[PDB]
Amino acid sequence: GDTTITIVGNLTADPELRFTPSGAAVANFTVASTPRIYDWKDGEALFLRCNIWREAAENVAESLTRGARVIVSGRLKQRSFETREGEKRTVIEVEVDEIGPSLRYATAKVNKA
Amino acid sequence: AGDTTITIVGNLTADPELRFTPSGAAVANFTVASTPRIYDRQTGEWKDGEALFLRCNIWREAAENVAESLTRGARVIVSGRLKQRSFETRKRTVIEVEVDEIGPSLRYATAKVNKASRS
Amino acid sequence: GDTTITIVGNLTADPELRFTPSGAAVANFTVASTPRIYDWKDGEALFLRCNIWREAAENVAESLTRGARVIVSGRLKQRSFETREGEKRTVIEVEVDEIGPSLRYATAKVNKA
Amino acid sequence: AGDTTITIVGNLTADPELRFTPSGAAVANFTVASTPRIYDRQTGEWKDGEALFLRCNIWREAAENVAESLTRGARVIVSGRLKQRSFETRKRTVIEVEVDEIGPSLRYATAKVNKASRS
Numbered sequence: 352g353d354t355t356i357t358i359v360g361n362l363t364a365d366p367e368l369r370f371t372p373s374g375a376a377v378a379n380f381t382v383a384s385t386p387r388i389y390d391w392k393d394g395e396a397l398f399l400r401c402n403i404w405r406e407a408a409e410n411v412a413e414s415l416t417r418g419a420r421v422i423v424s425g426r427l428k429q430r431s432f433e434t435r436e437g438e439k440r441t442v443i444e445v446e447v448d449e450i451g452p453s454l455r456y457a458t459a460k461v462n463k464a
Numbered sequence: 465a466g467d468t469t470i471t472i473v474g475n476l477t478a479d480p481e482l483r484f485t486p487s488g489a490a491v492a493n494f495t496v497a498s499t500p501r502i503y504d505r506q507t508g509e510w511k512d513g514e515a516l517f518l519r520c521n522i523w524r525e526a527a528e529n530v531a532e533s534l535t536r537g538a539r540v541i542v543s544g545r546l547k548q549r550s551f552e553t554r555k556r557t558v559i560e561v562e563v564d565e566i567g568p569s570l571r572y573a574t575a576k577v578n579k580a581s582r583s
Numbered sequence: 584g585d586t587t588i589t590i591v592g593n594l595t596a597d598p599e600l601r602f603t604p605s606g607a608a609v610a611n612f613t614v615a616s617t618p619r620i621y622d623w624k625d626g627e628a629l630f631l632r633c634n635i636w637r638e639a640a641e642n643v644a645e646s647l648t649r650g651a652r653v654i655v656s657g658r659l660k661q662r663s664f665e666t667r668e669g670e671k672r673t674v675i676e677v678e679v680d681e682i683g684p685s686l687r688y689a690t691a692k693v694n695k696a
Numbered sequence: 697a698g699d700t701t702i703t704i705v706g707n708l709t710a711d712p713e714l715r716f717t718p719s720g721a722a723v724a725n726f727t728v729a730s731t732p733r734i735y736d737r738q739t740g741e742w743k744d745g746e747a748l749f750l751r752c753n754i755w756r757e758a759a760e761n762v763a764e765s766l767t768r769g770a771r772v773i774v775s776g777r778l779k780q781r782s783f784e785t786r787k788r789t790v791i792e793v794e795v796d797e798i799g800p801s802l803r804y805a806t807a808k809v810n811k812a813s814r815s
C-alpha cells in the first residue's frame with residue numbers, strides 16, 4: 352500500500368533527539384545522498400528529512416553523528432499546504448522503518464541487548 | 465542497463481565467512497534470515513511468519529568491514545543486487561544477493577561507527 | 584548511486600505529451616498513490632510528478648488516460664529553491680525508467696512492435 | 697511486520713500458465729527474464745549481461761487478468777514479495793515472487809487498458 356524507499360547517504364548533522372510530553376523519544380535527521388561519476392566523479396544530490404521514534408530513535412541518537420553514512424528504509428510521506436498566504440507548497444518526509452550505519456567505508460562495534 | 469535490486473532486513477544466520485580469491489580480493493559470505501510478521505485476525509497477537517533465507521556475498525574492503533563488524537544473529541539492513549548463479553547436481557540455479565551497502569540496524573541496538581579515511 | 588522508488592497509483596489526469604524543439608517527445612503526469620485500511624478502508628495519499636521521455640513518453644501518452652492505475656519505477660530527483668523572494672522551497676520529481684498499466688483491477692491488449 | 701519486496705523488470709519466458717486451486721481460486725505462474733546491461737569499457741557498446749530468472753505466481757482476478765492480458769516475451773513491471781518455498785529432492789529451498797501488482801511496460805510498446813468495475 353505505502354510507497355517505500357531506500358536511501359544511502361550521510362547525515363547532514365547529528366540526530367536531534369527530542370522527547371514528547373508523553374515521554375516517547377523522537378529522532379530527527381536529514382540524510383543527504385550524493386552519487387558517483389566516470390572518467391572525475393561527483394554530482395546529483397538528494398536530501399530527505401527523516402524521523403524514527405521509540406527506542407530506535409534513541410539508538411539512532413546515540414549511534415550516529417554528522418557525516419555518518421547510513422542505509423535507510425522507510426515510507427515516503429508528503430503533505431500539501433497553503434494558497435491563503437501564497438500559492439501551492441509541497442513537502443516530503445521519510446518515516447524510517449530501519450536504519451543503520453553503512454559498512455562500506457567503515458566499521459562499527461555492534462552491542463546487543 | 466540496471467540490475468534488479470532489493471533491500472532486505474533480517475538477522476545473520478552465522479558470523480560472516482571471510483575468504484580471499486586467488487588474486488587477493490576479499491569476499492564475505494552470509495545469509496540474512498528475514499522473518500515477516502503474521503496476525504491471527506482472531507486472538508494471539510503478531511506472529512513470526514515464514515522466514516526468507518538469502519545468501520549474500522560482499523566484496524573488497526566492504527567485506528573486510530563486514531567480517532570485523534558483524535556477528536551471529538545481528539540485525540542488518542542490506543541493499544543489493546540479485547544474482548542468479550548456476551551449480552550442477554550430482555543444471556541448478558540459485559538466487560543470491562551481491563551487497564552494495566550493508567549496516568547494523570539500530571532497531572534493537574546501538575553501534576560505535578569508526579569512519580575509515582578518504583575524504 | 585541514485586535513489587529509486589516504485590509507486591503504484593492512478594494518473595490524476597491524461598499524460599501531457601509535448602515536444603522539445605529538437606523533436607524528442609516528453610510525457611508528464613502525476614501519479615496519485617492512495618492506500619488501504621481495515622475493519623472501512625482509505626487514507627494516506629502521495630502525489631508524485633513524473634516524466635518519461637523518448638518513445639516511452641509517446642507510448643505512455645497513447646496508452647494512458649485519467650484514473651489509470653500504473654506501476655512506476657524511476658529515480659527521485661529533488662531541487663532546492665529561493666530565499667531571495669521568500670525562504671526555502673523544496674520540490675521533487677520522478678525520472679521514470681519503466682511504467683506500465685497495472686493489471687490488478689483491469690486488462691489491456693499489449694501490441695508489440 | 698513486512699515481507700521483503702522487489703520491483704523486477706523483464707520479459708515473460710512464456711505465456712502465463714493459468715490454473716485453479718481446488719477451492720476455485722485462480723493462480724497464474726510465469727518467470728520474468730530480467731537482463732541487465734554490461735559495458736565493455738573498451739569498444740563495442742552496451743551488452744546483454746547475465747540474466748536473472750524469477751518465477752512469479754499472481755492470485756485471484758489479478759491472475760485471470762494476467763492470463764488474458766500478457767503473452768510470450770512481453771516486457772513487464774513486477775512489484776512483489778519474495779517467498780521461499782521448500783521442495784524435496786529425489787531438503788531444497790527455492791526463491792520465487794508473489795506478485796502484488798504487475799503491468800505491461802510501455803517501454804517498447806503501447807497498451808489499451810480496460811478498467812473493470814468497482815469505484
Ligand SMILES: [Zn+2]
Pocket residue numbers: 488489490524525528
Ligand atoms: Zn581487500
Ligand SMILES: [Zn+2]
Pocket residue numbers: 720721722756757760
Ligand atoms: Zn478467481
